[PDB]
Design a protein around this ligand. Structure first.
Ligand code: A1IB3
Length: 138
């Protein structure tokens, strides 16, 4: 187990068939979680479960370029629960990030940042206890 926030190094960036697994438990009174795949100061892929946005649960995904957030992609499907252990898996494909939570497909996010081999850090933050963060090649 690790104390958030935590940065997982992705040396030489990401590549298709790279599978990132994040294990943790959502805190009992959680408001938000974020994964940030970073290319320097840019955020290639921000994955942001929000537990109370206007009293609704939503997944917000976005990219940050030159310190500006772009067009949000939102999902109503919300697989997380306060207090409960989770597994987030991010599969890097040639054209998108694929996300599954607790072994169920959640969403895919088209690559806006094209230089996958420069996406060299994964930031993990928010209202979780972080158990582990690792990757393998499938
Ligand atoms: O609220 C936002 C921003 O939306 C952006 C995506 O469009 C980011 O989510 C921004 N964000 C979240 C976090 C964050 C999240 C966590 F879970 C953390 F634990 C943590 F430490 C930080 N850091 N930046 C967010 O301020 N907006 C209003 C409409 O959605 C958009 C900008 C117009």
């Amino acid at each position: 187990p690790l104390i958030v926030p935590y940065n997982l190094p992705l040396p030489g960036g990401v590549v298709p068939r790279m599978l990132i697994t994040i294990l943790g438990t959502v805190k009992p009174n959680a408001n938000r979680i974020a994964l940030d795949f970073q290319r320097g100061n840019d955020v290639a892929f921000h994955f942001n479960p929000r537990f109370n946005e206007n009293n609704r649960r939503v997944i917000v995904c976005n990219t940050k370029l030159d310190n500006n957030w772009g067009r949000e992609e939102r999902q109503s499907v919300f697989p997380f629960e306060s207090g409960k252990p989770f597994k987030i898996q991010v599969l890097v494909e040639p054209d998108h990030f694929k996300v599954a939570v607790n072994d169920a497909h959640l969403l895919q996010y088209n690559h806006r940042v094209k230089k996958l081999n420069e996406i060299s850090k994964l930031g993990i933050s928010g209202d979780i206890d972080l158990t582990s963060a690792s990757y393998t090649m499938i």
